[PDB]
Amino acid sequence: QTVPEGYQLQQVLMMSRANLRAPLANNGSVLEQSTPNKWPEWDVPGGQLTTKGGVLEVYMGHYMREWLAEQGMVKSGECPPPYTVYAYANSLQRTVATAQFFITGAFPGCDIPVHHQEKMGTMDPTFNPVITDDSAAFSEQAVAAMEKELSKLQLTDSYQLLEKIVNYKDSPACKEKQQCSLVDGKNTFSAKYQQEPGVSGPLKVGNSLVDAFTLQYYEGFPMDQVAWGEIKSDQQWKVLSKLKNGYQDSLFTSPEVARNVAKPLVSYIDKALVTDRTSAPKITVLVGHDSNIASLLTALDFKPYQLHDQNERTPIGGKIVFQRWHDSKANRDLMKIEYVYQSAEQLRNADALTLQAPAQRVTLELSGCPIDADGFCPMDKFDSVLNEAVK
Numbered sequence: 607q608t609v610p611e612g613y614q615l616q617q618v619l620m621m622s623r624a625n626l627r628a629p630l631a632n633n634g635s636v637l638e639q640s641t642p643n644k645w646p647e648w649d650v651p652g653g654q655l656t657t658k659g660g661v662l663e664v665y666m667g668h669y670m671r672e673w674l675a676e677q678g679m680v681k682s683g684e685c686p687p688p689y690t691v692y693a694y695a696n697s698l699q700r701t702v703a704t705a706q707f708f709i710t711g712a713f714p715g716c717d718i719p720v721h722h723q724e725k726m727g728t729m730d731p732t733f734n735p736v737i738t739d740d741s742a743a744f745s746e747q748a749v750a751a752m753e754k755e756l757s758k759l760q761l762t763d764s765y766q767l768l769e770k771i772v773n774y775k776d777s778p779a780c781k782e783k784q785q786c787s788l789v790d791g792k793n794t795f796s797a798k799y800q801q802e803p804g805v806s807g808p809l810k811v812g813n814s815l816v817d818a819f820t821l822q823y824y825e826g827f828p829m830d831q832v833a834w835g836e837i838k839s840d841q842q843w844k845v846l847s848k849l850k851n852g853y854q855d856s857l858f859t860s861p862e863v864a865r866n867v868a869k870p871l872v873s874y875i876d877k878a879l880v881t882d883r884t885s886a887p888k889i890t891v892l893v894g895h896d897s898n899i900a901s902l903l904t905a906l907d908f909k910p911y912q913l914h915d916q917n918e919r920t921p922i923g924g925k926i927v928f929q930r931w932h933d934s935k936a937n938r939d940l941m942k943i944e945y946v947y948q949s950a951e952q953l954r955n956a957d958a959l960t961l962q963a964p965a966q967r968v969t970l971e972l973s974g975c976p977i978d979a980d981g982f983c984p985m986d987k988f989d990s991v992l993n994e995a996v997k
């Protein structure tokens with residue numbers, strides 16, 4: 607796609623998801639349980655981003671810069687006035703790190719800080735995808751809603767395949783804990799107040815391992831290191847990644863769970879973009895997590911989508927960039943949202959990102975903001991979406 611003539615970009619807001627990180631330490635014991643195999647090592651601890659993650663984000667920031675300059679939002683090689691860019695990430699190493707690389711990459715040698723709560727290592731409610739309603743009746747409505755969501759999915763082939771690549775029957779889950787079937791395993795969904803919706807069972811092991819295999823791919827481990835050369839071969843990946851996208855769908859894609867869990871980001875966006883656009887900076891960078899993008903996208907009732915050359919519905923370094931454009935001809939404003947990310951090969955190979963060889967881009971759409979032939983939506987309808995979403 608290519609923006610039409612007569613349109614001038616006015617404001618940008620990116621919802622980013624941190625780049626290449628090591629598998630979550632939080633899932634450390636479920637990976638040991640799920641197989642008799644040895645797990646490759648990482649030089650970074652728990653779930654911190656890797657040096658490659660930073661390198662990949664630098665490219666992402668350089669591409670974003672070239673695009674922003676090309677669109678008149680900034681100039682190339684000169685750096686913008688004091689408060690042009692505003693970067694905010696939550697207090698996790700992972701998210702703050704990717705913001706530093708992104709910014710240093712987009713505006714090298716400038717003086718654009720990265721904001722975050724003073725308390726680091728802990729979560730910032732803004733980005734914390736937790737249940738903020740202790741209605742009790744709500745935690746029950748949530749669990750059920752999740753369960754129903756899982757029912758729409760079909761991961762039987764994913765599990766069977768997973769069982770084999772993982773040699774799960776020889777794992778200390780089948781031997782010792784009698785859990786010997788991912789496909790028949792019972793799933794129990796949680797939703798305790800002030801915490802992330804969870805899953806205990808085959809769906810967790812599924813998402814945990816596949817996430818580890820997926821990260822291993824990107825980090826560039828040789829093929830015999832990514833799932834021990836097992837997950838290799840064709841698109842067993844397409845079916846294995848369903849456990850990973852199905853996990854996300856059940857915990858954050860539910861309508862009533864999304865609306866709650868996302869409450870703070872919707873509120874944020876609906877303020878920097880609507881109620882307080884006059885005070886907001888031309889450019890904003892929110893670095894969050896896939897949970898945030900999953901619940902955010904749902905809460906604002908987005909139309910389904912599909913990312914080309916990507917197996918994850920929320921790409922490791924992908925960013926949802928909201929764009930307010932002003933149509934010179936007809937004195938009106940317009941919203942154009944797009945998912946800007948790096949394909950899997952772009953991540954695995956670490957390709958220099960430039961306008962010559964751009965990052966992947968898919969234009970999204972809001973149910974309440976029908977998109978036109980060029981992918982634009984009137985700022986009127988969008989406004990109503992966010993102002994309605996916050997209610």
Ligand SMILES: O=P(O)(O)O[C@@H]1O[C@H](CO)[C@@H](O)[C@H](O)[C@H]1O
Pocket residue numbers: 623624627735802894895896897898
């Ligand atoms: O987007 P990342 O941080 O890489 O991964 C996500 O992070 C979420 C917390 O923000 C957590 O709840 C999800 O399980 C995890 O997949």
